[PDB]
Amino acid sequence: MTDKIAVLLGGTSAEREVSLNSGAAVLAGLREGGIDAYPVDPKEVDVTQLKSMGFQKVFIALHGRGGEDGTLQGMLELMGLPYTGSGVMASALSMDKLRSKLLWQGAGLPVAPWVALTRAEFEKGLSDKQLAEISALGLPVIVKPSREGSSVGMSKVVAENALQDALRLAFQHDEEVLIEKWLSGPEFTVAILGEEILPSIRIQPSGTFYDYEAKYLSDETQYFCPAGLEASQEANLQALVLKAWTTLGCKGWGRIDVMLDSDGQFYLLEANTSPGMTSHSLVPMAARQAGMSFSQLVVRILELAD
Amino acid sequence: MTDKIAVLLGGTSAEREVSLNSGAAVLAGLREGGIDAYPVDPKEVDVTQLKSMGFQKVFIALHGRGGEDGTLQGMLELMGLPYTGSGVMASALSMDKLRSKLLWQGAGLPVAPWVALTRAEFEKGLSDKQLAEISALGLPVIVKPSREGSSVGMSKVVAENALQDALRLAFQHDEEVLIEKWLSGPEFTVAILGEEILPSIRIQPSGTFYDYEAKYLSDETQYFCPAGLEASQEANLQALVLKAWTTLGCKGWGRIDVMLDSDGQFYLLEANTSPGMTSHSLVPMAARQAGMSFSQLVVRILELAD
Numbered sequence: 001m002t003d004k005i006a007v008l009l010g011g012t013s014a015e016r017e018v019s020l021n022s023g024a025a026v027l028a029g030l031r032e033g034g035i036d037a038y039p040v041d042p043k044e045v046d047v048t049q050l051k052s053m054g055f056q057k058v059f060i061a062l063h064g065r066g067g068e069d070g071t072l073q074g075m076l077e078l079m080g081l082p083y084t085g086s087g088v089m090a091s092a093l094s095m096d097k098l099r100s101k102l103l104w105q106g107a108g109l110p111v112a113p114w115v116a117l118t119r120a121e122f123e124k125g126l127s128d129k130q131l132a133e134i135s136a137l138g139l140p141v142i143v144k145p146s147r148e149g150s151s152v153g154m155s156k157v158v159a160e161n162a163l164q165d166a167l168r169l170a171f172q173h174d175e176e177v178l179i180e181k182w183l184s185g186p187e188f189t190v191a192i193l194g195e196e197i198l199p200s201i202r203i204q205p206s207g208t209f210y211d212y213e214a215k216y217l218s219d220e221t222q223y224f225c226p227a228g229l230e231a232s233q234e235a236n237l238q239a240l241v242l243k244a245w246t247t248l249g250c251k252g253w254g255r256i257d258v259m260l261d262s263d264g265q266f267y268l269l270e271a272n273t274s275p276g277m278t279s280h281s282l283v284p285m286a287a288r289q290a291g292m293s294f295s296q297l298v299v300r301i302l303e304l305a306d
Numbered sequence: 307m308t309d310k311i312a313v314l315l316g317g318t319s320a321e322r323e324v325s326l327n328s329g330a331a332v333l334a335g336l337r338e339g340g341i342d343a344y345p346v347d348p349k350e351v352d353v354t355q356l357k358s359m360g361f362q363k364v365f366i367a368l369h370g371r372g373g374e375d376g377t378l379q380g381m382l383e384l385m386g387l388p389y390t391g392s393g394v395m396a397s398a399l400s401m402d403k404l405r406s407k408l409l410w411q412g413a414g415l416p417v418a419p420w421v422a423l424t425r426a427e428f429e430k431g432l433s434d435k436q437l438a439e440i441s442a443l444g445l446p447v448i449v450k451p452s453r454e455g456s457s458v459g460m461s462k463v464v465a466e467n468a469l470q471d472a473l474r475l476a477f478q479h480d481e482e483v484l485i486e487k488w489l490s491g492p493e494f495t496v497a498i499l500g501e502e503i504l505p506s507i508r509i510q511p512s513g514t515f516y517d518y519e520a521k522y523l524s525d526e527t528q529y530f531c532p533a534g535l536e537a538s539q540e541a542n543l544q545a546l547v548l549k550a551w552t553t554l555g556c557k558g559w560g561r562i563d564v565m566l567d568s569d570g571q572f573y574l575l576e577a578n579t580s581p582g583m584t585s586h587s588l589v590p591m592a593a594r595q596a597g598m599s600f601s602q603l604v605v606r607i608l609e610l611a612d
């Protein structure tokens with residue numbers, strides 16, 4: 001028999017609905033490519049049983065903690081099943097925006113000014129030190145959970161009083177949250193596939209930022225691929241993303257989000273080590289520009305597994 | 307029945323023999339403490355079977371990659387067994403000295419000047435930029451694998467022409483290697499147990515550095531607990547270790563290694579998230595100074611598990 005592949009999709013994160021759609025697309029692409037692939041939802045199926053169930057390899061189409069944060073990767077490593085995407089460390093680090101930012105800053109790479117807060121600090125009241133650091137960011141700011149995706153838990157803050165409500169929202173999702181200087185844009189994303197950096201994308205939301213609706217449920221978001229930069233700036237963006245990728249230790253495939261600010265410089269937002277694969281998703285757009293069918297894309301991601 | 311605890315020991319890393327000794331001590335301390343503990347060696351026993359075998363919780367007494375680097379933690383998380391020490395991210399990060407250093411530098415914490423190299427770069431010939439960066443460290447330097455323990459693969463380089471052999475040695479143990487400025491010492495270590503920072507230890511090897519023989523097989527190494535610092539410097543050391551610990555995201559217990567340099571300042575070397583527990587080991591020494599039996603120590607570590 002040829003290899004039986006499990007496409008892991010759904011799960012129980014805030015990105016479940018997106019993952020169900022990513023997995024649906026991946027499953028079809030793999031079967032179209034001649035791969036004996038089957039959908040497996042960890043919400044329904046105990047994933048510690050995959051090997052016992054007869055699977056040879058795993059395509060990870062989960063998003064968020066418990067699929068994308070090193071935990072599942074560790075289990076698959078010990079079970080001895082090859083799997084797509086980054087290993088334990090790089091998956092855990094890429095999920096943790098606070099620690100990605102620290103790593104990248106330690107490496108001399110460009111990141112937006114920011115303040116990190118814990119839920120325990122917020123509950124008690126912030127120090128004068130922290131309040132001064134927050135004030136120095138100016139307004140607006142963006143507030144985000146450290147370990148989410150799909151713009152879950154995020155908001156733009158334009159008044160000091162409402163920072164509290166933005167923090168409360170983000171703290172529903174994580175015990176660690178980031179307050180970041182608002183960047184002017186424009187916004188970009190760059191997909192990586194093995195050793196190939198795919199054509200860049202410029203993303204233009206119709207509203208204040210690339211929120212959940214703008215990502216998955218809007219026909220108003222615009223996309224430009226390649227991004228339409230001057231050749232030197234496209235080279236600058238590619239070199240930045242490659243250094244960010246290598247600094248985190250990522251492998252296989254992924255997507256790094258970047259924005260310009262008013263100073264004309266690129267800033268790193270985050271890396272994603274199990275990117276969206278839906279009809280609205282960005283890695284498929286870059287791959288299409290690179291002359292790949294969606295089927296060719298997913299077969300390639302699978303071939304790259306250990 | 308009351309809970310059956312698996313003490314994981316041995317495994318297949320370069321630190322196997324240390325781990326067999328750590329686990330032997332932990333097993334006895336747990337049983338003296340009234341805990342129904344059993345030794346389980348992942349070299350002999352399929353660790354994916356622990357829950358099936360009837361275990362309720364796991365005491366990790368493994369050292370090195372595959373017990374200490376987040377992989378096993380991920381498996382245990384998905385199996386649903388509580389386990390001792392740090393989670394997936396902090397274990398993976400603490401094992402990766404290169405990425406710990408970047409994280410800590412990003413956070414403004416003191417780390418020795420260094421250069422990181424990959425094995426592929428070394429095989430081809432280093433760039434002029436890399437050669438210039440190595441020269442700027444001066445001599446002597448220490449060379450270490452990124453992801454080892456127990457001083458495995460490490461050497462001091464006092465002459466330019468001996469750097470290549472030191473690099474070749476370290477590259478036997480990891481594909482990523484660090485060249486670091488030689489620090490004058492003295493050398494310290496600080497153990498963390500839950501929220502408690504234990505009494506500091508000053509370590510005085512008889513030779514060039516605290517090598518494998520000095521760690522595990524010598525009656526010549528000297529230890530001072532507490533470290534014998536002035537009150538203000540002891541406070542400084544504790545504050546630095548606590549910030550390093552929290553920046554990594556570690557939990558449960560662990561030990562951070564620190565050295566003075568000739569400027570009189572402390573520099574962070576690394577964190578260890580599954581510390582040695584042998585008769586030569588440091589966490590037990592700190593615990594004894596804090597008025598605990600070894601049995602009380604390991605019972606507390608186990609109580610702290612998820």
Ligand SMILES: Nc1ncnc2c1ncn2[C@@H]1O[C@H](COP(=O)(O)OP(=O)(O)OP(=O)(O)O)[C@@H](O)[C@H]1O
Pocket residue numbers: 112142144148149150151152154180181182183184187209210211257269270272
């Ligand atoms: N500092 C900032 N200033 C302005 N806009 C921002 C900033 N940070 C993030 N954004 C906006 O918020 C969106 C989501 O932020 P980010 O990519 O950091 O987190 P995410 O929720 O993990 O996204 P993903 O779906 O890619 O996983 C960005 O695509 C961008 O539109």
Ligand SMILES: Nc1ncnc2c1ncn2[C@@H]1O[C@H](COP(=O)(O)OP(=O)(O)OP(=O)(O)O)[C@@H](O)[C@H]1O
Pocket residue numbers: 418448450454455456457458460486487488489490493515516517563575576578
């Ligand atoms: N930059 C340096 N200068 C001088 N000595 C050093 C330096 N870095 C490390 N050492 C020496 O080498 C020893 C081991 O280094 P380090 O703690 O970084 O790695 P390790 O192999 O993971 O140790 P462990 O058994 O604690 O896990 C230190 O205890 C110290 O004696």
Ligand SMILES: [Mg+2]
Pocket residue numbers: 148149150270271272
């Ligand atoms: Mg994301």
Ligand SMILES: [Mg+2]
Pocket residue numbers: 161162164
């Ligand atoms: Mg209010």
Ligand SMILES: [Mg+2]
Pocket residue numbers: 216217218280
């Ligand atoms: Mg639609």
Ligand SMILES: [Mg+2]
Pocket residue numbers: 150257269270
């Ligand atoms: Mg994003």
Ligand SMILES: [Mg+2]
Pocket residue numbers: 454455456576577578
């Ligand atoms: Mg170590």
Ligand SMILES: [Mg+2]
Pocket residue numbers: 522523524586
């Ligand atoms: Mg002895």
Ligand SMILES: [Mg+2]
Pocket residue numbers: 456563575576
């Ligand atoms: Mg050490």
